[PDB]
RNA sequence: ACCUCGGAGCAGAACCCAACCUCCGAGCAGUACAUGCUAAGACUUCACCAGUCAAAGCGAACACUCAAUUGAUCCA
RNA sequence: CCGAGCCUGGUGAUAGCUGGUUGUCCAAGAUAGAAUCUUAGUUCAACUUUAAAUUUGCCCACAGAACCCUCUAAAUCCCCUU
């Protein structure tokens, strides 16, 4: 009932409705949400990508090449987080990972690149 | 120090020993290293180093300190950013 | 016959060290590193705080 | 009981029975006897023994070791520091299960204080309470709550459940006055208007993210949406809800209480409430 | 303090449940505290004695101190060694069983 | 003349320990200019204060020599 | 009873110095040091007392602990078993 001057309608005249507070791109329903007890909780995020529609075909074709170990056998891309006791924010970071994967899709070594250099040299041979 | 006050009849805090440490909850005290400030241009690195920390106290120095404090100074603190907020309280102690 | 002089630099300014030098010895021109631009930069002497 | 039955057969207690608890009377030590008193526990002659030991911290003349370290600003401004009491997510489920704290209404510092839930102190330079992220998981309850500051994922926990938070701010003076409103009848004087935040605070009360009660509600759908494409929740619709009218309701700033305007007296004795009618004394008010 | 209200559902999503109806057929009863909670409590007493106390006990303590040791005695291998406070009707235990006991007094009926 | 620090007679062989005395020395200097940052574990002049060594890591490059060579708090 | 009168007050001045510190019975209980206008004292450590928590403590056997100075012994440290 009471208004003084600092109400919210005197300092924001264009907001006036009740509602206009509360009027309302990954598909939570697609995904396959599982939490464990592993202290840190631990969740996990699971997916098909073959079958995901709501990703882009070359998309989808990068990611499976990039992140081919993440692949189960029957194909659902896992990915998992275990850096929070809440499991809020560990599903966070599950769905952050998602989203930073399709962007790098869209857009210690030296030892092993000695090696297989060394085996091509080997190789040098013909029937 | 005044362990009973002529005005309200109270034990009176020694202002020297807020001036210089920090209480954590848990009873123990923070320090910085004496000399700290002083003539770095003739230290090592590594003594730079080891003056640059902030360490705990013995406990008869704590004993000390509790004595020498009122019962103000060892209340539970919800400062609203506080950087040693983590190490008011101890974890995974055995005795 | 050593004096304590503070050493600034050219880029990332606002940082500085002290050095000794010879007291004879022309102004000192060094290259150190400077943390605020994370690299090697020249730094010159501004003046001698003391006398060791 | 047995000791009951026990009583019935034993003498009438009186005043002549009585006896205290073993253990709880320590026996009185006194400096008599061979034991106890010939030097009196205080040794051999000297300093300590003729009662003018030195006092507390000095070390017979070394520097003693709390002058020996250096000051530092530990405890520069303690005094001017805010200060804000942690209400758990937990500690709130568990006070609405209890039914200590009443969910169909708006939950205030009034209704957490009155549910015994917190414990306010204005002095000790309390600002309010800080809804803080524990028992984010496992709490399922839809609450309208006003708290002074809220944690991004304790945001996230309310919304999820189609609650409401507002982040509100009050002066020592409103937060003694809203966590003790009875005292503050008894004193007799009118309702004051809780003054704005510092201008240091203005920013965090004037942001949509914190759910500032001075910030744009237009800014408000948007960082709701945000919140909950982070945390991976579908964002409820409070307005299909038959509580809507209950959680939009919110006290406007320069108002302590929800029904009662500024510049009001409260009259317990006799149940009345009296409005100034000046037009100088509304205006007070009412700016 | 207000009576707790009635939930479709049990435990409540604190965790908390309200007492059996009717009271369990026990020689000992556990009475709750004024908040409605099960009256088990840590104690440490010289920096270093951890012990817990059930505290509002009624009737045969004694048959309520042999199923304590019943209980954590798989626990600790050995039986737990316990203080019997017929006065005040409380027992004592060496060492931290909060949680373990709680449950064990819910799951009675306590 | 001496009061602080380092060495020898001096604990014959882990550590510590010979007051007083008899001798010596120190109160610097030179080369770097990453003499950057950070961090497990340790030593310790029998307390405290001080003091000492250091894995891994970040960033660089392809944590100097010397027996001591030194000074807390306040304050400016 | 004048190198600074006497009386009263402040004043129960202060005294790291001297002297004194009052029933009964039982128990545990002794000599590394450091700093200090400091050695007639105090603070820290060492030792001592009590209560509490928990696992090792002591005694130890093989193995192990430097050269230089041209010499150097009784020994010590470490240490399973017992
Ligand atoms: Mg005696
Ligand atoms: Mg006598
Ligand atoms: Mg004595
Ligand atoms: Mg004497
Ligand atoms: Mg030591
Ligand atoms: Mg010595
Ligand atoms: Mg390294
Ligand atoms: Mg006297
Ligand atoms: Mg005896
Ligand atoms: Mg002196
Ligand atoms: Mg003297
Ligand atoms: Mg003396
Ligand atoms: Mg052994």
């Known amino acids: ?98 989203r930073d994967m399709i962007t790098e899709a869209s857009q210690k070594l030296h030892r092993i690149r000695i090696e297989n250099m060394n085996r091509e040299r080997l190789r040098q041979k013909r029937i | ?82 950087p040693y907020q983590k190490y008011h309280d101890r974890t995974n102690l055995k005795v | 016959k050593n004096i304590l002089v503070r050493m600034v630099s050219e880029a990332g300014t606002g ?15 060094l290259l150190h590193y400077d943390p605020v631009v994370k690299q090697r930069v020249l730094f010159v002497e501004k003046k001698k705080i003391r006398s060791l | 009981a047995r000791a009951l039955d026990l009583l019935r057969g034993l003498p009438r ?27 009196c526990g205080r040794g051999h002659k000297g300093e300590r023994q003729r009662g003018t030991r030195p006092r ?12 020996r370290i250096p000051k530092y600003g530990f405890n520069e401004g303690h005094s001017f520091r805010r200060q804000y009491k942690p209400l758990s997510l937990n500690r709130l489920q568990y006070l609405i299960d209890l039914g200590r704290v009443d969910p169909s209404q708006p939950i205030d510092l009034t209704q957490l204080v009155n549910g015994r839930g917190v414990t306010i102190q204005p002095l000790k330079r309390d600002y309010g309470v800080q809804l803080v992220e524990e028992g984010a998981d496992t709490f399922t309850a839809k609450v309208n709550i006003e708290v002074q500051l809220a944690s991004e994922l304790a945001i996230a926990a309310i919304e999820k459940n189609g609650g409401v938070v ?20 008894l004193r007799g004087q009118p309702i004051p208007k809780r003054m704005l935040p510092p201008e240091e605070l203005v920013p965090y009360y004037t942001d949509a993210k914190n759910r500032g009660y001075l910030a744009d509600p237009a800014k408000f759908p948007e960082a709701r949406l945000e919140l ?21 309701t919110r006290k406007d700033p320069r108002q302590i209480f929800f029904g009662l305007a500024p510049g009001w007296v409260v009259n317990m004795a006799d149940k009345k409430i009296l409005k100034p009618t000046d037009e100088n004394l509304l205006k007070y008010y009412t700016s | 303090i207000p009576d707790p209200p009635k939930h479709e559902h049990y435990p409540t999503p604190s965790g908390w449940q309200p007492p059996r109806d009717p009271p369990p057929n026990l020689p000992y009863f556990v009475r709750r505290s004024r908040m409605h909670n099960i009256p088990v409590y840590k104690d440490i007493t010289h920096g270093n004695r951890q012990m817990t106390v059930i505290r509002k006990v009624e009737g045969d ?38 949680q373990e006991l709680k449950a064990w007094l819910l799951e009675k009926g306590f």
């Open chain 1, 1 to 98: 009932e009471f208004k003084s001057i600092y109400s919210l309608d005197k300092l924001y005249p264009e907001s006036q409705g009740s509602d206009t507070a509360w009027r309302v791109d990954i598909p939570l329903d697609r995904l396959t949400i599982s939490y464990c007890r592993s202290v840190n909780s631990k969740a996990e995020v699971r997916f098909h990508l073959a079958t995901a529609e709501w990703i882009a075909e070359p998309v989808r074709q990068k990611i499976a090449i990039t992140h081919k170990n993440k692949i189960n056998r029957l194909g659902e891309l896992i990915l998992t987080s275990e850096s929070s006791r809440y499991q809020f924010r560990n599903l966070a970071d599950c769905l952050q990972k998602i």
């Open chain 2, 1 to 82: 120090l005044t362990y009973f006050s002529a005005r309200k009849g109270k034990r009176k805090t020694v202002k020297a020993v807020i001036d210089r440490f920090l209480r954590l909850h848990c009873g123990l005290w923070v320090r910085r290293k004496a000399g700290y400030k002083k003539k770095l241009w003739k230290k090592t690195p590594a003594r730079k180093k080891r003056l640059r920390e902030f360490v705990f106290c013995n406990k008869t120095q704590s004993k000390l300190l509790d004595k020498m404090t009122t019962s103000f100074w060892k209340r539970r603190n919800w400062y609203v950013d506080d």
């Open chain 3, 15 to 29: 940082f500085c060290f002290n050095t000794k030098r010879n007291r004879l010895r022309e102004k000192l021109t």
């Open chain 4, 13 to 39: 207690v009186s005043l002549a029975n009585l006896k205290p608890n073993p253990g709880s009377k320590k026996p009185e030590r006194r400096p008599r006897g061979r034991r106890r008193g010939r030097k």
């Open chain 4, 56 to 67: 507390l911290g000095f070390e017979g003349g070394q520097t003693p070791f709390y002058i």
């Open chain 4, 166 to 185: 507002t982040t509100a701010f009050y002066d020592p003076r409103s937060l003694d006055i809203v966590c003790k409103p009875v005292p503050f009848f």
């Open chain 4, 228 to 248: 909950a494409r982070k945390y991976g929740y579908i964002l409820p619709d409070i307005t299909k809800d038959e509580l809507f009218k209950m959680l939009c």
């Open chain 5, 61 to 98: 303590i004694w048959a309520l101190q042999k199923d304590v040791e019943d209980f954590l005695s798989p626990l600790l291998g050995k039986t737990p060694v316990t203080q019997v406070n017929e006065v005040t009707g409380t027992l004592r235990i060496k060492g931290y069983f909060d």
